[PDB]
Amino acid sequence: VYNDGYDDDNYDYIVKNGEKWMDRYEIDSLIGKGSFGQVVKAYDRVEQEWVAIKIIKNKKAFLNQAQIEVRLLELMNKHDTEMKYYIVHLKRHFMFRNHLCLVFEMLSYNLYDLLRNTNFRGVSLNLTRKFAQQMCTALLFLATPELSIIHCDLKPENILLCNPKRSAIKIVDFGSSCQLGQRIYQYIQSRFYRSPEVLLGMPYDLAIDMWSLGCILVEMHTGEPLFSGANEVDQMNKIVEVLGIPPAHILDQAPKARKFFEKLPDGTWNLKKTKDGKREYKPPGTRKLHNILGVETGGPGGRRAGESGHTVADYLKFKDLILRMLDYDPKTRIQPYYALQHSFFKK
Numbered sequence: 001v002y003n004d005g006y007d008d009d010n011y012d013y014i015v016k017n018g019e020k021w022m023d024r025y026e027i028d029s030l031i032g033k034g035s036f037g038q039v040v041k042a043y044d045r046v047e048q049e050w051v052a053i054k055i056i057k058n059k060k061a062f063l064n065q066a067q068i069e070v071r072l073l074e075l076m077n078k079h080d081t082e083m084k085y086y087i088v089h090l091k092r093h094f095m096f097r098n099h100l101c102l103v104f105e106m107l108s109y110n111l112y113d114l115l116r117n118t119n120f121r122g123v124s125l126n127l128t129r130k131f132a133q134q135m136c137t138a139l140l141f142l143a144t145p146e147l148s149i150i151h152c153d154l155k156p157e158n159i160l161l162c163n164p165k166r167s168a169i170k171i172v173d174f175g176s177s178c179q180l181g182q183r184i185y186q187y188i189q190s191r192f193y194r195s196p197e198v199l200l201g202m203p204y205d206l207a208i209d210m211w212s213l214g215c216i217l218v219e220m221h222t223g224e225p226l227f228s229g230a231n232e233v234d235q236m237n238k239i240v241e242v243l244g245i246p247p248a249h250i251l252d253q254a255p256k257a258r259k260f261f262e263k264l265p266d267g268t269w270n271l272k273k274t275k276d277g278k279r280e281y282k283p284p285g286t287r288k289l290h291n292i293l294g295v296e297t298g299g300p301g302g303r304r305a306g307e308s309g310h311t312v313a314d315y316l317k318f319k320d321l322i323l324r325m326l327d328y329d330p331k332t333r334i335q336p337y338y339a340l341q342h343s344f345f346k347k
């Protein structure tokens with residue numbers, strides 16, 4: 001028996017459609033499940049509107065982390081700027097049957113559902129540009145010194161459309177987020193979108209979100225993840241296929257450098273030796289983003305050949321921005337303010 005019967009064996013609240021909570025919220029259905037807990041669709045009888053309620057797991061570790069998400073959401077929402085409207089709005093929170101419940105504004109489906117709806121053909125470069133500009137503005141908001149918030153889990157699933165037929169988006173799931181000073185985890189971000197500094201076990205800052213954004217934007221247009229690693233070793237090697245060996249000044253400071261690389265006598269770094277002449281990856285830096293995007297061959301897989309807004313000039317700008325987002329060095333990786341000035345966004 002878990003939580004007097006209200007919970008399942010995974011600390012989740014057993015959702016029952018049609019249940020009414022505190023004579024206010026009418027639970028319609030389950031929207032999604034995550035490590036944090038479940039999000040349900042519910043009607044707020046008081047305010048007479050539809051809301052999304054995130055039911056946090058009934059477990060100390062998850063409750064304590066969700067309390068941080070609340071602190072950060074309330075801190076962002078209080079700030080007055082139009083940029084704050086790229087972050088989902090937390091209306092209120094409450095405890096119910098030993099679950100912390102977060103009430104959010106209702107949104108539409110996420111960018112992964114959007115990709116799946118195109119059968120993973122990818123969205124247009126113009127739509128990608130719209131998402132990129134909004135995301136860069138959102139990251140600029142998080143970078144404001146008073147906030148200095150690191151989302152730490154940017155991915156298609158955590159970027160939602162406000163309206164199913166409109167391009168406006170908002171960022172969700174700040175549970176794993178932290179502030180620049182208060183970093184408390186080492187293994188963070190979803191693997192496909194994890195930055196090299198996190199893979200290498202080095203200290204991280206807001207630049208890790210810019211890395212994830214670069215990965216996301218490419219996936220949005222091509223329809224498949226740029227670095228689809230099955231584990232950390234596979235992830236690092238897939239990054240190396242495209243960007244080459246990380247610079248020595250980074251690896252020389254990386255605690256986990258020898259999980260993926262080895263230092264030669266002449267001081268240079270190379271990938272760890274592979275036994276028995278097994279070939280599993282393209283040589284470092286040979287998987288060109290120029291070809292992944294189809295810059296001069298009509299877009300990803302030639303699917304955008306003879307389409308408006310998919311000129312080579314457009315792709316060369318897109319490629320340059322992505323490569324500046326995928327800089328190995330977090331100190332030189334493009335920052336939101338300057339990314340927004342990139343020619344890719346010129347009117």
Ligand SMILES: COc1ccc2c3ccnc(C)c3n(CCCC(N)=O)c2c1
Pocket residue numbers: 031032034039052054088104105106107108109110160172173174
């Ligand atoms: C639909 O409106 C919404 C509105 C707000 C949120 C929200 C706020 C915080 N964290 C998460 C995971 C949130 N989700 C998850 C959806 C997952 C999905 N496939 O739609 C939301 C959804």
